[PDB]
Ligand binder design. Sequence first.
Ligand SMILES: Cc1cc2nc3c(=O)[nH]c(=O)nc-3n(C[C@H](O)[C@H](O)[C@H](O)COP(=O)(O)OP(=O)(O)OC[C@H]3O[C@@H](n4cnc5c(N)ncnc54)[C@H](O)[C@@H]3O)c2cc1C
Ligand SMILES: Cc1cc2nc3c(=O)[nH]c(=O)nc-3n(C[C@H](O)[C@H](O)[C@H](O)COP(=O)(O)OP(=O)(O)OC[C@H]3O[C@@H](n4cnc5c(N)ncnc54)[C@H](O)[C@@H]3O)c2cc1C
Lengths: 474, 474, 474, 474
Amino acid sequence: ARTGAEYIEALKTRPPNLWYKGEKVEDPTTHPVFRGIVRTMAALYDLQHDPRYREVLTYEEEGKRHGMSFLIPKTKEDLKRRGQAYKLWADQNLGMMGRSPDYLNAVVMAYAASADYFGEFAENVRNYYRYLRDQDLATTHALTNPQVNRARPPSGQPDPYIPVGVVKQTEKGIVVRGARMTATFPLADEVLIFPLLQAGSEKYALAFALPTSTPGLHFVCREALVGGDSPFDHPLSSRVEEMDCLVIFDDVLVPWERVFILGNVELCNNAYAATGALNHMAHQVVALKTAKTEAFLGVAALMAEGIGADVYGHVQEKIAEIIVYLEAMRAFWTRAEEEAKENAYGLLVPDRGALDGARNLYPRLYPRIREILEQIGASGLITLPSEKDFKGPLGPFLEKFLQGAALEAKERVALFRLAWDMTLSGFGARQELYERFFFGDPVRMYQTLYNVYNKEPYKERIRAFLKESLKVFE
Amino acid sequence: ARTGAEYIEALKTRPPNLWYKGEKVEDPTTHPVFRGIVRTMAALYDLQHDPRYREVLTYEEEGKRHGMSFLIPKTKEDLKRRGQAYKLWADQNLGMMGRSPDYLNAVVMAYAASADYFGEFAENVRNYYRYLRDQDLATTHALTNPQVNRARPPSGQPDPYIPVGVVKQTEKGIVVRGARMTATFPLADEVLIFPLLQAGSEKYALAFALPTSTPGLHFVCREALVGGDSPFDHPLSSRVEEMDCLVIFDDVLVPWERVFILGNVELCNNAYAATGALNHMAHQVVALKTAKTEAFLGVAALMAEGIGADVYGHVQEKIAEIIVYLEAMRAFWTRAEEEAKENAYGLLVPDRGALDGARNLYPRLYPRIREILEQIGASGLITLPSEKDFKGPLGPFLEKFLQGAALEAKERVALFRLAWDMTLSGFGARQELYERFFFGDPVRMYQTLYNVYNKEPYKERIRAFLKESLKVFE
Amino acid sequence: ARTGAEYIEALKTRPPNLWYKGEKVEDPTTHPVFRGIVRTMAALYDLQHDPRYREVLTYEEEGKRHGMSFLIPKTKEDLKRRGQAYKLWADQNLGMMGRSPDYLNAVVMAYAASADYFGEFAENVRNYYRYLRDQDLATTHALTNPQVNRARPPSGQPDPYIPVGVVKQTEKGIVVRGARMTATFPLADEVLIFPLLQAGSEKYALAFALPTSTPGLHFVCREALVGGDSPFDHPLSSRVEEMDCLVIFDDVLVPWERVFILGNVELCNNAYAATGALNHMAHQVVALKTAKTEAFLGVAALMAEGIGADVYGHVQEKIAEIIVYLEAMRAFWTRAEEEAKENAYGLLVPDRGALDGARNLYPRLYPRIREILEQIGASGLITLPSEKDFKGPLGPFLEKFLQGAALEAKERVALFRLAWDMTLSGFGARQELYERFFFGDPVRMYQTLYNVYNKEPYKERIRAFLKESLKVFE
Amino acid sequence: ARTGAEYIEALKTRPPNLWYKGEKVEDPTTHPVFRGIVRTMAALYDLQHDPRYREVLTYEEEGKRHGMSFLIPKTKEDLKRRGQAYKLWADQNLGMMGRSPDYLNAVVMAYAASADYFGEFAENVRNYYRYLRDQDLATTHALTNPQVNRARPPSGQPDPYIPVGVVKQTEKGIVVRGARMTATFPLADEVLIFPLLQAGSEKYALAFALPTSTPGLHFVCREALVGGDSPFDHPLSSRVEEMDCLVIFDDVLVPWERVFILGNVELCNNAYAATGALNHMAHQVVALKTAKTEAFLGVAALMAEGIGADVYGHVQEKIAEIIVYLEAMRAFWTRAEEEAKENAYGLLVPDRGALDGARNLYPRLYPRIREILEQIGASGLITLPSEKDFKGPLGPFLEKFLQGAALEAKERVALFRLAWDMTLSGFGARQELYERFFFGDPVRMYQTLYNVYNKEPYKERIRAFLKESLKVFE
Ligand SMILES: Cc1cc2nc3c(=O)[nH]c(=O)nc-3n(C[C@H](O)[C@H](O)[C@H](O)COP(=O)(O)OP(=O)(O)OC[C@H]3O[C@@H](n4cnc5c(N)ncnc54)[C@H](O)[C@@H]3O)c2cc1C
Ligand SMILES: Cc1cc2nc3c(=O)[nH]c(=O)nc-3n(C[C@H](O)[C@H](O)[C@H](O)COP(=O)(O)OP(=O)(O)OC[C@H]3O[C@@H](n4cnc5c(N)ncnc54)[C@H](O)[C@@H]3O)c2cc1C
């Protein structure tokens, strides 16, 4: 298990090939756009060594201590342990960090446990898992093709190599060219280029991993959403801005030992479901969204009490709505673990029904949770003087005009600055788009659910009920 | 455990004091408006003796066999057993029967287990429970005051005795006068007049039970929603029309042994929560709504496949939405049982958090589930020829024009007649209003949730997070 | 202009070929399922002769008096006149009659004014218009193909003649075979079989009209939704149940003079838009929905005041929501008339933009308006004793328990019976499905709007705004 | 009529008493946070002198040229003229500038036309109007009390002078102390402290205006939302960030000639409605939101076409939804002008029904319009490289990977940067909160609509319809 210092030293020594506004980022640990999130990830690693949480965040195995997200669960109790670690890490950042490495460790863990799925590349997968686990490395991933012409398949874009495709194969490995649309949290040691491809997309049907410093690999950052470094003025964006980037592959060499899937469309399409990676990554997600909803509930309640709006029925109802959604997520989480069963490879996986429910329902609930905070806070959400204003000549006036019902002005503004950062700052607004799409496009996710769900039991019950209807003709 | 024949004989012998369109109902077992639901309840009782379900629906105790809904659960396994019985009974009627007696048996069971709550009336409660259990009687209940002037409390209506109040107390019991707004499924042996009263409502703070044939007690039926007796034309209304009625008390004598609460506002207000009746009745409800949602999923899928509409993405998405809601209810159900703990009286009760989530979320989901069926079926939902049309001269034409994609015309119309009866018939539409309000007014239910929920843990996490914000002033 | 007596005599003399539950309807003017709506239509005709409304409902032309819906408007004032007639007729039935003949007269009027559109059949159209106008006949229409396999086109169904198609052409006319899915209000003298067909549907690309008594023509009625004849118990279903039916064509001969379009797919697809029939029929619709919304507003307000629920903020807000929707419809109506312009044939047509807005927005608003009534009335909506109960032994008790805040019990129940009939009776629920689909499937209506709307002006404004963005590279 | 140069010189000479992060803003015309919006307002003034728009934006009167927003309309044509000016100004900034001065000029114009309303202060109002008109000054306003304890009235806050109240009256005027919660666009010459106060709020029942440089008057700015100065990277926030601020009154002297209402609660509460200011300001708003919706439609269409997503039905439907909302706003606008009538003071005012519909409906529509853009753009909305990236080493790669369907990469990113700035940047997200609340709290706005609307006509129609119901008892 890594310490924060080791993570920081690793990024400083071998920084990811990041670019910000036309320039290479030489040291993300000190760069104003990335130092906040780097310190945040470092704090997550350090927590693994805190005596209070060591037993929750790590496990011992033959003299070594590994991060809990690498644990191959054998019992439901083990699943619960993984869940508690997901939750503890999530709570540290109020569920605002959506791509902490444990999400992808869940994927790689499942891939390894179900390694036989990958055929000749099975050993590569098992070895990669051990590598990530032993070194406790941080990962980032990019799974979607460039948004160019969505009316055409990957092979029908303006150029054959817009999506990442194999240029050629050599004795050393494969050379790839193209790009992946989005990679969140590129402050990692490794990048996973993992897998719905249509038939005839063989050259794009790939799955591999690479060090983020690999020659020819570039991460182009979008506009930064860090509001500043003041924790008062920017409570969340100053520390949890994970960054999103376009990933470019300029004839990058992928060593054979890093290849997990090559030229197999079906193998790519069913990788997450067959291995159980889908189940485990969604397990981290349900714990994460439960933590996120808890944070929103806390802020909504404090805001309402803070300005005396809690006496109004509709405000109480809005907060109760968040409570209902919180309980729904807790329920999915519980059922996912309690109904867990082993898959074809013997890997215990949390229930897909419950997790499909959670990941397809939360994208609908989050925009409403965000709306509720807006409706409760109203103008208080944009009446945001800075800590500098409180420290300035008008400070005394602000302490009078911005106090709340039994709440001091500085505390009140600190709270609304947080509520604003969770909803209306560039950082906060991005979180909304993130919740709507991180797991996929709802339109296709729902179509996928329809097709995979076993609807026969219900159709049969109705056919049986209709027997009496048709008997009138006998 | 009662058989259907015993239930039918009991209603025939001592019929409830029902009135329909100005006339007394002498025999509900043969009356056209009530015979269907009577046969349906009778079938539920008969199922208790079916070898296939006897172990699910009943339990043995010292030579006797009792209905599972009377079982005082001591373990989570016992809770699961109660849940399986709720579900099996619910499935028989596609979750359309909302007031089957097991809902109220759950209430009385909890009242009895937590009998100490009732003080001097504790023995009356325990004895009443044993009575209902041993005789396996059917119950109905009425808990709301007449909807007259909602701007005023029970004591501020046009007359002091519009709500049910105590006129006087005698050596035999109490004399009550007034009315209860609604009692669903009055085809029962007993009626429960159970309990938010404001201070000063002592004369209305009552809780008692009476035989439905008690002199002075009247049940005034609303417009009947039985479409007819043909199972083809009216698959649900011909058998599951439970009926709703206004309950009148014309100076009715309630024997002291039937009094459970007398003149105690606080005791009335906290009765369901303190005894655990709330938890157990909501447990029956979550199982019931899971069954109901399963029925809607089955019909939606069959309709879409039936007319070839399943090939359209948005139709698949609508069905997937029902699947998401189904999984949400299953999740609440699972967590309610898995997180069960004993209350102050030592009674194991399913988790209130999960159940409050389920009963406050389903009223929002049901209208949408109903809407989805409407959007999928479109004009097919009102193109409803009768079985008589298929049996008539134009039958051959109908078999051609109303066939579906690989579905025979009679089967197609049988299906759409069912979908219509579940949504658009008077019977179906009532179900919507029922789901919106049976457990209470959402406005007040949400206000109640806000006030009872422990929000402190979340507020504290935020206050802790804000410590760094306020430190900038140090 | 016809009188009600003339309409009744016409239906009695030459009744439409209606079938109800396997039997031919010999006299719809006296049949229990149809006599109510027949009397209602008769009353609409009689209103044309009422001195108070004669100038609003009819116009004089060379010694004759014609119904206003036949007026070919030459000025915006004429459009306003047509609108006032639509509204006056609509108000008579609280906007619950959705297929009164003036809707189709608007279509035929436009077809006639734009007769050149039909080529060689132009004279047939002009003559048919004059026929309907002079005789002031009632019409019904059926435009959709049987809902059998929606995954395939009209030519890909289980049989080539499921949809209405031409079997052969003779010296007398064309012989057609097939069926139309739905025809509402078949208590008419004439049926219009008017027109999105895909290429290759020539044999189905038809447009013609026939007397409803034509040999081989059959109207198969769906389950009746008439609750009874009591105006107290069934205020709307006893008089406004228009009925829906499947229309069968058993090798029906259509005389050449009744053919308007034959074997021309494009001509069929653009018929409503090119002639202006779309604009005028939608004009009747916006006036109709304005009347309907006014009725819902009135009932919602009376219900709230009636039970003292009007003192609650959220109830006031719900009623205000209906007011907002009412104003939106009034606005569309006003703009449709004020922005009217002549089409290619010189026919003044109300603005399509405003009408497309109204007909695509109301299907979304109506379900909410209906929901609002449910949320306001709650249990009062199913506490529906009959007039027979008030006339019976328990009458005195009901007058006490069902009175409202300053409202007598009989008046209160009369009101809630109406609210129930507008929302929850089989009649009321059907109205919801009707609003969702009568003008077409929202999915395709929205796709149609997207494709026909001129989006260029807005795209150009954005491109212009972006000029400054691209200049940074100069 | 002012030129942009005159406006800039005025702010430079007598800058508003603005504060940003604890420091006084000496010159907002050059300050990085304010120079953009100052240039934007200056451009609006300059447009008044453009030969192409002079006749639309100004009117001639006795040798002088005044801004159209000052025109006291005498005919509907004059109303149309005011509307066209509102629209032309709005289009310049895609409807993103919500507090351009013409909104408040509409208020002052109405106040002046209805000056008699103000009694002894009538002349002050007329003179103030002439002052603003002749000098063509820019105004800002603040109408709400500090959000401290919303459970209590203005007189029940922690201090009597949290809200703005009169400390004392002198021969020169009144001395006021307190604060107003929000003032948008403080880059103005004048601030309007205009008016629902409860009885007993006399000391707070004020209405006056002051130069923004008045001693003791302070504007405390919230966190700035200017993303930068690049029009490519920040197309809107670089120029339309109006800024919001808390307004402090430190014993400010208000000259008697600037007092419009003093110590009169009722006069304050009915000021906007009685004078017609409500009608005219809402008229500017409906034109503004029509312009805003047009911009969103243009961007949505370009985005969909740009990435080839326009071929998908649901995307077309989402764009059509925006079209429906656009037409709804156009309709309200048209009806507001066409149904205009004179008020009690003889001032022609646009219809309140239509405007109440527009201002109470748009706050519900905007969040959905914003959501639609998010659903269409998906990950493209956060894949935002900078113009600096295109100008850097990876430029060639970006031109390949971020091109669209028949759209160059730079154009594509320019477009998505705009879409992002309209929805997800701090600037864009604020616009959402702004639309939800700028005209007031929806909860209270709806309650206000319920209370002021004449519901009698609809209630009467229902009572009349129910006559037949009650006749069954005769
Ligand atoms: C903040 C944020 C963070 C993210 N982080 C990551 C990450 O860390 N790793 C990663 O791999 N991905 C990440 N993503 C990407 C996310 O997984 C995708 O946004 C998502 O899967 C949907 O595809 P898309 O964005 O390419 O949109 P598109 O597919 O381009 O769709 C645009 C629109 O077109 C529609 N459309 C397009 N194609 C079809 C179709 N075939 N059928 C129906 N409709 C169609 C979509 O419905 C929609 O309305 C992130 C996204 C966001 C917004
Ligand atoms: C089909 C159906 C079956 C039912 N079956 C049963 C049954 O078997 N047994 C039983 O006991 N009950 C039954 N009920 C009753 C149900 O429990 C009640 O409808 C519900 O609790 C709400 O109260 P109410 O109907 O009296 O409506 P009301 O309280 O009259 O409310 C009408 C409207 O007024 C509002 N309003 C009124 N008071 C307030 C307030 N204080 N604060 C805020 N808003 C207010 C409500 O929000 C709403 O918009 C049934 C109801 C239906 C519809």
